[PDB]
Amino acid sequence: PDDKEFQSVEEEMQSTVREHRDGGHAGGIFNRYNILKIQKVCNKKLWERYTHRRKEVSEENHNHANERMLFHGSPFVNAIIHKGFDERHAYIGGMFGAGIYFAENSSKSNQYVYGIGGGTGCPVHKDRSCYICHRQLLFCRVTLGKSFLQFSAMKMAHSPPGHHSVTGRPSVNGLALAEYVIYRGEQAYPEYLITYQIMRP
Ligand SMILES: Nc1ncnc2c1ncn2[C@@H]1O[C@H](C(=O)N2CCN(CC(=O)Nc3cccc4c3CNC4=O)CC2)[C@@H](O)[C@@H]1O
Ligand SMILES: [Zn+2]
């Protein structure tokens, strides 16, 4: 795998960092990361499941898959790489109900690596702002198809009728940053596994 392909992922990871409203409570205090490793995930069965669904979505969306590269933070990265994203692990909870959530800002996804609101932080030091423990984030291929634009909380079980996803747009008394929600696990492929540390400013 080319170093230039990985430089592009590294650049997306670094440039999409934003200052969070919680002052770093969930994901820690940092302006940049120390990127340790970028691995391309090659799971043929998951890739075929993804491309089969992408073709179905494109056909239902004027021959346009509306694919985006987006981040996903989770304590379950290893199960995701082996078994794929699974909506059965999603329960009504979160702004847009029982879906699989993605961010275009790496720092947003970083707030979910150790759990919701950062959980209790890293397993070894119980620190949400740990600068020592190595974190992992996924940089995913996500099929949005016809995405339903929403500003306020809308607890869905599935995509709205005629749609393939939900796009959560930033609003005054709502989201600070965008979020993208799918309700079918086969609509995302965990393309890159990023191993990194947040860096002390
Ligand atoms: N194959 C699998 N095996 C085990 N767990 C799996 C799995 N595929 C997905 N999951 C897991 O399911 C969990 C899940 O759906 N949940 C729990 C969390 N909840 C809220 C939410 O996702 N918010 C949210 C908002 C914005 C970005 C991000 C997130 C999460 N990660 C991000 O980057 C929505 C429902 C998630 O923590 C994880 O990805
Ligand atoms: Zn730690």
Residues paired with 143 in a beta bridge: 67
Give the CATH number of domain 1-201; options: 3.40.50.1980, 3.30.420.10, 3.90.228.10, 3.40.50.720: 3.90.228.10
Asked if 171 and 7 count as a contact pair (C-beta separation under 8 A), the reply is no
Instruction: Give the span between the Cα atoms of 27 and 110, in whole angstroms.
Output: 6
Ligand nearest to the CA of 131: 2
Q: What is the chain's alpha carbon radius of gyration, rounded to the nearest angstrom?
A: 16
- Beta-carbon contacts of residue 42 (< 8 Å; ≥ 6 apart): none
Instruction: Give the span between the Cα atoms of 29 and 49, in whole angstroms.
Output: 38
Q: Is 42 annotated as a binding residue?
A: no
100 CA: nearest ligand 1 atom:
15
Write down the domain spans for the chain.
1-201
* Candidate of 74, 85, 184, 186 to mutate for ligand 1, largest count of ligand atoms within 8 Å of Cβ: 74
Q: Is the CB of 74 under 6 A from ligand 1?
A: yes
- Per the entry, the structure determination technique was X-ray
In the chain, the DSSP E strands lie at: 33-40, 67-72, 100-102, 135-143, 147-150, 165-168, 179-182, 188-198
Q: Is 122 annotated as a binding residue?
A: yes
Angle 71-73-78 (CA atoms, 0-180°, nearest 5)?
110
Exposed/middle/buried for residue 7 (C-beta within 10 Å: 0-12, 13-18, 19+):
exposed
Q: Give this entry's resolution in angstroms.
A: 2.0
User: Nearest-CA neighbor of 33 among 144, 161, 167, 130?
Assistant: 130
**Residue 106: C-alpha distances to residues 119, 131, 180 (Å):** 18, 16, 13
